[PDB]
Amino acid sequence: LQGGMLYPQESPSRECKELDGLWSFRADFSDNRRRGFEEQWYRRPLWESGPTVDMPVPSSFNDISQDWRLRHFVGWVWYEREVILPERWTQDLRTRVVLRIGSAHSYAIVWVNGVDTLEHEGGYLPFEADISNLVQVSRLRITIAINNTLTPTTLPPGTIQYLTDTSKYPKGYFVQNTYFDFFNYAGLQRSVLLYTTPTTYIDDITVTTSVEQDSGLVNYQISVKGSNLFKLEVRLLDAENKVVANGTGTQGQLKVPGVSLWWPYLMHERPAYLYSLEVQLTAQTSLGPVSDFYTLPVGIRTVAVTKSQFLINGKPFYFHGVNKHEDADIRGKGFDWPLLVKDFNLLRWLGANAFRTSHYPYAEEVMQMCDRYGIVVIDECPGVGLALPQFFNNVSLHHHMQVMEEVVRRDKNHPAVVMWSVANEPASHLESAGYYLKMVIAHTKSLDPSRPVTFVSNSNYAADKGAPYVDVICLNSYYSWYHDYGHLELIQLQLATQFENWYKKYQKPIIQSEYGAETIAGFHQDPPLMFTEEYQKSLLEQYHLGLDQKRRKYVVGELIWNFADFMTEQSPTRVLGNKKGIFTRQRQPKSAAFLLRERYWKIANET
Amino acid sequence: GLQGGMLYPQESPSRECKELDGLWSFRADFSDNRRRGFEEQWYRRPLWESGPTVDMPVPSSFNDISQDWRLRHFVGWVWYEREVILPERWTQDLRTRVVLRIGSAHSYAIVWVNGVDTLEHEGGYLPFEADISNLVQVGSRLRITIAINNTLTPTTLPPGTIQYLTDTSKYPKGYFVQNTYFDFFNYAGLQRSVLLYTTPTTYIDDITVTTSVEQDSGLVNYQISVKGSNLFKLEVRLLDAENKVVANGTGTQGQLKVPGVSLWWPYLMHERPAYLYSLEVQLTAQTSLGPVSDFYTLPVGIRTVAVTKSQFLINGKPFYFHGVNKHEDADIRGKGFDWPLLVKDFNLLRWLGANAFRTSHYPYAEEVMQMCDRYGIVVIDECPGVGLALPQFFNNVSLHHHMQVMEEVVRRDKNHPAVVMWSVANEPASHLESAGYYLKMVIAHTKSLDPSRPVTFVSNSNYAADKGAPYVDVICLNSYYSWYHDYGHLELIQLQLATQFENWYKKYQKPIIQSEYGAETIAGFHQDPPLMFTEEYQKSLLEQYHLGLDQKRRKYVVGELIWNFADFMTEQSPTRVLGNKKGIFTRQRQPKSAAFLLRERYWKIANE
Amino acid sequence: TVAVTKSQFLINGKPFYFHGVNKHEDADIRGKGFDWPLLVKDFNLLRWLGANAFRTSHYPYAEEVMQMCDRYGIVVIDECPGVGLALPQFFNNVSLHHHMQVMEEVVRRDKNHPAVVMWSVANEPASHLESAGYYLKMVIAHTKSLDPSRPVTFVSNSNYAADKGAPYVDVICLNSYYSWYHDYGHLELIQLQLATQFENWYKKYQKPIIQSEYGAETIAGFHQDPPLMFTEEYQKSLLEQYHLGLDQKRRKYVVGELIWNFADFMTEQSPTRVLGNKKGIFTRQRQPKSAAFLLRERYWKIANE
Ligand SMILES: *[C@@H]1O[C@H](CO)[C@@H](O[C@@H]2O[C@H](CO)[C@@H](O[C@@H]3O[C@H](CO[C@H]4O[C@H](CO[C@H]5O[C@H](CO)[C@@H](O)[C@H](O)[C@@H]5O[C@H]5O[C@H](CO)[C@@H](O)[C@H](O)[C@@H]5O)[C@@H](O)[C@H](O[C@H]5O[C@H](CO)[C@@H](O)[C@H](O)[C@@H]5O[C@H]5O[C@H](CO)[C@@H](O)[C@H](O)[C@@H]5O)[C@@H]4O)[C@@H](O)[C@H](O[C@H]4O[C@H](CO)[C@@H](O)[C@H](O)[C@@H]4O[C@@H]4O[C@@H](CO)[C@@H](O)[C@H](O)[C@@H]4O)[C@@H]3O)[C@H](O)[C@H]2NC(C)=O)[C@H](O)[C@H]1NC(C)=O
Ligand SMILES: *[C@@H]1O[C@H](CO)[C@@H](O[C@@H]2O[C@H](CO)[C@@H](O[C@@H]3O[C@H](CO[C@H]4O[C@H](CO[C@H]5O[C@H](CO)[C@@H](O)[C@H](O)[C@@H]5O[C@H]5O[C@H](CO)[C@@H](O)[C@H](O)[C@@H]5O)[C@@H](O)[C@H](O[C@H]5O[C@H](CO)[C@@H](O)[C@H](O)[C@@H]5O[C@H]5O[C@H](CO)[C@@H](O)[C@H](O)[C@@H]5O)[C@@H]4O)[C@@H](O)[C@H](O[C@H]4O[C@H](CO)[C@@H](O)[C@H](O)[C@@H]4O[C@H]4O[C@H](CO)[C@@H](O)[C@H](O)[C@@H]4O)[C@@H]3O)[C@H](O)[C@H]2NC(C)=O)[C@H](O)[C@H]1NC(C)=O
Ligand SMILES: *[C@@H]1O[C@H](CO)[C@@H](O)[C@H](O)[C@H]1NC(C)=O
Numbered sequence A: 001l002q003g004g005m006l007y008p009q010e011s012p013s014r015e016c017k018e019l020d021g022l023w024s025f026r027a028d029f030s031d032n033r034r035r036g037f038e039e040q041w042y043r044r045p046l047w048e049s050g051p052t053v054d055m056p057v058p059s060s061f062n063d064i065s066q067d068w069r070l071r072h073f074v075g076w077v078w079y080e081r082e083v084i085l086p087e088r089w090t091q092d093l094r095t096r097v098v099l100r101i102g103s104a105h106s107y108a109i110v111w112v113n114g115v116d117t118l119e120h121e122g123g124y125l126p127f128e129a130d131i132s133n134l135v136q137v138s139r140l141r142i143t144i145a146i147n148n149t150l151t152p153t154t155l156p157p158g159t160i161q162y163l164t165d166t167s168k169y170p171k172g173y174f175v176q177n178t179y180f181d182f183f184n185y186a187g188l189q190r191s192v193l194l195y196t197t198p199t200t201y202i203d204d205i206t207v208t209t210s211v212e213q214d215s216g217l218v219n220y221q222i223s224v225k226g227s228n229l230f231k232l233e234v235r236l237l238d239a240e241n242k243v244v245a246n247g248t249g250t251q252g253q254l255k256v257p258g259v260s261l262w263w264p265y266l267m268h269e270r271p272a273y274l275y276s277l278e279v280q281l282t283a284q285t286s287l288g289p290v291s292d293f294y295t296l297p298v299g300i301r302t303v304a305v306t307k308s309q310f311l312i313n314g315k316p317f318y319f320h321g322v323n324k325h326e327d328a329d330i331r332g333k334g335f336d337w338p339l340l341v342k343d344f345n346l347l348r349w350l351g352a353n354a355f356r357t358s359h360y361p362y363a364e365e366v367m368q369m370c371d372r373y374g375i376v377v378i379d380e381c382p383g384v385g386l387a388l389p390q391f392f393n394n395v396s397l398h399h400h401m402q403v404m405e406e407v408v409r410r411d412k413n414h415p416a417v418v419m420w421s422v423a424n425e426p427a428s429h430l431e432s433a434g435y436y437l438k439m440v441i442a443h444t445k446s447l448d449p450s451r452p453v454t455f456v457s458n459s460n461y462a463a464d465k466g467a468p469y470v471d472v473i474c475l476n477s478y479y480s481w482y483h484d485y486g487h488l489e490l491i492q493l494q495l496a497t498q499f500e501n502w503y504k505k506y507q508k509p510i511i512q513s514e515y516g517a518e519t520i521a522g523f524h525q526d527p528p529l530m531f532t533e534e535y536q537k538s539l540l541e542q543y544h545l546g547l548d549q550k551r552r553k554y555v556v557g558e559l560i561w562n563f564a565d566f567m568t569e570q571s572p573t574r575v576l577g578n579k580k581g582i583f584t585r586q587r588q589p590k591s592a593a594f595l596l597r598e599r600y601w602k603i604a605n606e607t
Numbered sequence B: 001g002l003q004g005g006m007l008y009p010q011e012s013p014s015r016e017c018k019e020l021d022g023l024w025s026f027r028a029d030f031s032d033n034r035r036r037g038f039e040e041q042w043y044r045r046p047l048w049e050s051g052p053t054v055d056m057p058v059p060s061s062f063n064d065i066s067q068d069w070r071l072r073h074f075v076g077w078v079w080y081e082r083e084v085i086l087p088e089r090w091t092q093d094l095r096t097r098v099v100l101r102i103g104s105a106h107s108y109a110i111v112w113v114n115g116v117d118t119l120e121h122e123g124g125y126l127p128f129e130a131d132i133s134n135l136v137q138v139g140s141r142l143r144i145t146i147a148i149n150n151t152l153t154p155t156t157l158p159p160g161t162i163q164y165l166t167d168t169s170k171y172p173k174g175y176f177v178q179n180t181y182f183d184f185f186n187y188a189g190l191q192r193s194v195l196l197y198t199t200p201t202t203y204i205d206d207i208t209v210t211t212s213v214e215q216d217s218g219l220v221n222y223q224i225s226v227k228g229s230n231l232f233k234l235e236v237r238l239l240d241a242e243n244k245v246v247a248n249g250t251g252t253q254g255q256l257k258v259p260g261v262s263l264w265w266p267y268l269m270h271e272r273p274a275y276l277y278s279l280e281v282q283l284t285a286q287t288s289l290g291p292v293s294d295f296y297t298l299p300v301g302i303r304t305v306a307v308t309k310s311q312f313l314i315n316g317k318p319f320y321f322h323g324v325n326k327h328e329d330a331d332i333r334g335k336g337f338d339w340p341l342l343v344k345d346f347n348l349l350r351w352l353g354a355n356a357f358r359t360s361h362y363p364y365a366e367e368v369m370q371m372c373d374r375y376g377i378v379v380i381d382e383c384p385g386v387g388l389a390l391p392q393f394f395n396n397v398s399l400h401h402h403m404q405v406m407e408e409v410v411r412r413d414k415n416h417p418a419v420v421m422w423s424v425a426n427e428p429a430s431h432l433e434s435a436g437y438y439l440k441m442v443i444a445h446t447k448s449l450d451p452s453r454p455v456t457f458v459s460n461s462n463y464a465a466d467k468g469a470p471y472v473d474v475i476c477l478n479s480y481y482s483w484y485h486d487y488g489h490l491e492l493i494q495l496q497l498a499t500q501f502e503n504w505y506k507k508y509q510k511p512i513i514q515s516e517y518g519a520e521t522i523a524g525f526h527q528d529p530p531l532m533f534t535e536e537y538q539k540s541l542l543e544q545y546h547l548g549l550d551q552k553r554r555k556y557v558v559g560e561l562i563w564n565f566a567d568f569m570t571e572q573s574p575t576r577v578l579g580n581k582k583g584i585f586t587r588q589r590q591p592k593s594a595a596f597l598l599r600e601r602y603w604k605i606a607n608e
Numbered sequence C: 001t002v003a004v005t006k007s008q009f010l011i012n013g014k015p016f017y018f019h020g021v022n023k024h025e026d027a028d029i030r031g032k033g034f035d036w037p038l039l040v041k042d043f044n045l046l047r048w049l050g051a052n053a054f055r056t057s058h059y060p061y062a063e064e065v066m067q068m069c070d071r072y073g074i075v076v077i078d079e080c081p082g083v084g085l086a087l088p089q090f091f092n093n094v095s096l097h098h099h100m101q102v103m104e105e106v107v108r109r110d111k112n113h114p115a116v117v118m119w120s121v122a123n124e125p126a127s128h129l130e131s132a133g134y135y136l137k138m139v140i141a142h143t144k145s146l147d148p149s150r151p152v153t154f155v156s157n158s159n160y161a162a163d164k165g166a167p168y169v170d171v172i173c174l175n176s177y178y179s180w181y182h183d184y185g186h187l188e189l190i191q192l193q194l195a196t197q198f199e200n201w202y203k204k205y206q207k208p209i210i211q212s213e214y215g216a217e218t219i220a221g222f223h224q225d226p227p228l229m230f231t232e233e234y235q236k237s238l239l240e241q242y243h244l245g246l247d248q249k250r251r252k253y254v255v256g257e258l259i260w261n262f263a264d265f266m267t268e269q270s271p272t273r274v275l276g277n278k279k280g281i282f283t284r285q286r287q288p289k290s291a292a293f294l295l296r297e298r299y300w301k302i303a304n305e
């Protein structure tokens, strides 16, 4: 699809106006879910068409109210905000004004002063529109309708089932079925803002980095929109903002003598060294000469994979990390600065050097933090819950390829991202799924030459039709937890068999990408039983003993499920969500957290 | 406050707003003398140059963000810094006035702009600002550095003391502790939003509105202050909820008459509560750079408040407070402002049937007060006069600072229809004659500032000993029978409450609010018959209080406020299980079983 | 045999170290009622824990408990109900005579149990009072007249300089809760204040010392980092710091440590007691809190030395 998606920033040529805070909100509870479109609510302020309530942004809407119908609502929700713009934006026609929505859900439509201006399919990814025309020819009214319905061609997929036995269900009953283990929160869960650029502007930047002996090589490619009469100057600044290299034009290669490489946290005493690429555009326009500035952080580092090693900067790397989720009390998947910083403080405390974005791209601000703190990332698209054969077809395939393209567009420049994951626990025993995954992986590889690609599997080693195409094998297993309930004594044997079976077949590096135990804080027993803190500890110890037998050979990582307790749909196996966290949902450590911490610092200190 | 107005920043045709939320660079100054940052003048250069720094979210308290043991209980100076790229028009167009606004800080805060000393403020929970136009209009990113001191002293509000313990057989060299006498954690940081905003160089600086009723008509009495040029004219228009003009006038003062007015009613007092008009002030002024226009719009709720010998009247009708005490407190962010928790809390209040809260024990974020106006939740707006426990805290110096603090409180919140009473203190040592005079003067000062509302302080004194009680318009009583004495003895509660109300009313003949009662309650602890700390004990204690309240709430008891809305953090001690557990909601905003009980009562009272 | 020197507690002529617990006769529903399953469970947990001793805080336990000690090898400091003697009016000639008779009954019942290795005549009496000093002298003398075969003590929380009973004991037993009952939350002070405690007590008295109580109220499932009072992390850390201090003297003149308490137990209602006393390393239902595992490791380590 079209154009770049650079994270907005202030610069000499660009302003940003955050639209955080209260928006007006209404769920459309009409039987056919379309009354808002029938009455065209967007033509007028939202309150004119019925009761509205306040909804905070960014936030999920699902836990904010005490309305019993809203948490599990399936349909369109309607948000609205009125903004007073700086007069300079609306009167000075050299100003380009952009409305950026950080994310939405399955579908979103945006109206600006009642005019339909922007649409987007799929959650967890940003979208924007140049609204200069609507702003410059006295309030801006922004209306956003968001659909949260998951279907056989959304990512994640789902199904909708109407149940028409009127002796067991009321007239019109339907439910949303899903096959992924996290709650389908919705809303405007990420920051919404307006920003400006000149009418000729830096639209896209692509950087890749390599090393020559002790030299750093920074390849850049720059895309400009608007006038095709311009010049580009590019500088690379060191940590103290000294110019160490410079160039020109839409593309080039900068050389950095005696380069400071970007190293993961605990892989170097001074990890995460960031240079900055300052891009300066001088263009000739219809109203005279314009200047545009954008500055992109750059970490000079390489990623490679052998038959048994995962190499960062040509040195063997071992993932000792976690899986996370965008999830917290009350706000759901809503972005929050204090929770963000707290989580990173906990990651560093834990000795974690990595996480996977189970199971969707996280807020960009999370990736920025990773680049700065040296926490490597397996960046994963929302290809989770692909459990039924009907989800694997040509339309879903091409949709999945488009989403991966979006993920790569957004995140291609983060040094912290060291691998792409295209799915989690797809039905990859299916031959249709093997082809599907072959093609999504090949597509991803064709978009970014610089990173390995994988998908995370719970398939049997002999049956997995996607396994041949991954650069690194990522395996989920929960021995004694999802089978042989309580039998801690079986873990080492089953794990040994797992690794031997998989490596014998594929001769590719393996990551244990999930393992854990549901654990209710304060539940204690000796001997240990499932759900106690002691069972969590024991299960971790047995996994750790298994991992020890192969982690200096061909197992190149371990990621605990999960960093913290998080919300899921109601079911008899989910005690107010998923409780496999090593931290509580309120970011305090269960006893197992300390056990894992010891392990991670011990492994890190092996040098 | 002394220096001019303090209107809540908003965008208008003449005014912009740029929030500075997100990451700031941060360092605590752990030097032995706590002054290295001033000795080395860290503010003269980017903060990272003077040593290690870390990220700190704003708004948030700093105390719970890290895993650093010594940071949570740190006492001294912390240093924050942000760099800002400003719009070119702000720096280049000399008609722009650029203002730096800090929502709140702590005991002391100093602010530097590009290394230049620019703004200082004493006391927490209250906003302060400076015109920085000259520093931005040089002819480069703006660097804002803020040092915040969290030390409480005999002359701070809340007060405290510092104790150096020199017995090296028991304490390491240099050991000191902050002693306090209030029951909430002394969190610190940039807990409220920091922003830049603009106005013209001649601008609307202050607005004061008061409202009254004549038969069927609303009266809106306005007073406007303009700073900058001396030559100007003002237009004022009152707009109804559908934005049509209902009244209009001119000048620096006047009275708009509103025919057939829609009064502002508390939640559940009327089917359509919280009716707000808007007062749109348009300034036209002649300046050195030509004529300018300034626009500011103030929400207005037309309502009156009065106190009789037995009733609290809103719009001339008897009102009964059935509400809660709150705190600015949540996991991780401490006292940090947060939009989701704010909306959640208001949803829970309306679910509960609560029509009121007290800002125990400091003014809350302005955004909270704005929500109270819009949701119809009335407010007893309380300054940080809590922990005044020791004779030494009542000094002529403490009294002046307290008077100034009330001035800031009144300046900030005087225009909120939801605020129906000022509280100048909570549980001061009001048995003391010095405390009685001190309170007399703070209260008199407050009354002189604001003619439109009653004034109180909240007491746990014995009715015979309370030297402050004569000066309050409404008597507000804290009591915890069976909890803080006669442990477990639920059977005593109705008797002791009856005695309380009889004694207090016989002495004073003024309306009474039960401003605190409750029980520490650990969610999940159950026992029959009930024992302290169980949910059943909380329920039973509430039931007994409610029965006592019922005997006087149609007579001279005009309110009840449960302690507390939610579990919140305190200092460590053997009586505080990870803070105060008297919430009817958990700190994560879910109801304990007692919440349902209180809810049924409040709706029942509302429907009478 | 049992004997005491200026620095050692000797069983069968060999240096002994108490690594044990305090208990109570206390369980859900039955209160102090005797129960066979709970008895056997507790001894199974004592052995699992590596505990070699307990004190019968603060009253003699059922005879059956003593029979178990004899068969399982868990030594006992057998303590009479001389607890709560906090007021001056409790130290009179009438109370003294009564206490002497109670000690007679205690000794008569338990004199033949090999597991009982020491009598304790009181717990935290107001032993700073000169009347209390005389009172305890007499009860101790009376106890020795009844049984020549065992040492006698009482358990103290007095200031070392003020304790008027301390001259009369064979073994000094001290209770302290640094960072818990004072300097709330200050885990960093424990090692220092404990060093000072041992140095002061031993300089003055030159008799073997048992740390007879230490601990932290701990609600199972409360967690925080950094640790706060009432969390499992705080219990662990307080224990760790106490252990480090004990380590500095446990091969010199400190001859025992007894954690308070084996399990959470019931008390009167008050603002400092969350449904009773929560200082257990086990819950009232006999499951381990995380600190129980920490103590277990220590006890087996010490045993193996
Ligand atoms: C920002 O945050 C700051 C940090 O919290 C805060 O500063 C603190 O302010 C509090 C008061 O609010 C002060 O607490 C009082 O301290 C009184 C003693 O003060 C004197 O001694 C202090 C310690 O000195 C030792 O350490 C320093 C630093 O290393 C060293 O320089 C000295 O040489 C000493 O060294 C010995 O000990 C070291 C270990 O501690 C060891 O390493 C060394 O080897 C030595 O053994 C000292 O800090 C004080 O210094 C201040 O004052 C002098 C001017 O006199 C000035 O030059 C300094 O720059 C300091 O100035 C700051 O603070 C002062 C306030 O004192 C303020 O005026 C300034 O503007 C500036 O902010 C000083 O030398 C102590 O007496 C007092 O306690 C009494 O009073 C209280 C209240 O009444 C009672 O509760 C107490 O019990 C006690 O009184 C009792 O009752 C009285 C009767 O009334 C008496 O009869 C009884 O017997 C009993 O005494 C307080 O504890 C605290 O010292 C100070 N800390 C520091 C580090 O500065 C600052 O104000 C905040 N600023 C803002 C704007 O918010
Ligand atoms: C925004 O949110 C919306 C709300 O979620 C999304 O809309 C939903 O999309 C779902 C798919 O994601 C749809 O689910 C599928 O439904 C079909 C059946 O569709 C037909 O019937 C529907 C129900 O009709 C009744 O109710 C409606 C609602 O009030 C009325 O309008 C009807 O008049 C009718 O009313 C009677 O009953 C009601 C009680 O409910 C009474 O009150 C009345 O009095 C009447 O008695 C109906 O909703 C469907 O209408 C859609 O399609 C029409 C075209 O045919 C179109 O005109 C409509 O505008 C509407 O279009 C919208 O949805 C379609 C998708 O269908 C989109 O193309 C379009 O873009 C619009 O968004 C229609 O009339 C059902 O067959 C499916 O189930 C099969 O397939 C799944 C997946 O494979 C399987 O898992 C199932 O098992 C099942 O397959 C089996 O079926 C049999 C099982 O028994 C078995 O026999 C077979 O073997 C087979 O294998 C799905 O369930 C859902 O219908 C739709 N809901 C609504 C209200 O629109 C919306 O898409 C989303 N938008 C965006 C952009 O994100
Ligand atoms: C880098 O910048 C300098 C100074 O502007 C310029 O002279 C030089 O040509 C640049 N070097 C390049 C383009 O490699």
Ligand SMILES: *[C@H]1O[C@H](CO)[C@@H](O)[C@H](O)[C@H]1NC(C)=O
Binding pocket: B248, B249, B250
């Ligand atoms: C306000 O109403 C109109 C609109 O400006 C105007 O005609 C009238 O003079 C004003 N009334 C006043 C100043 O009272």
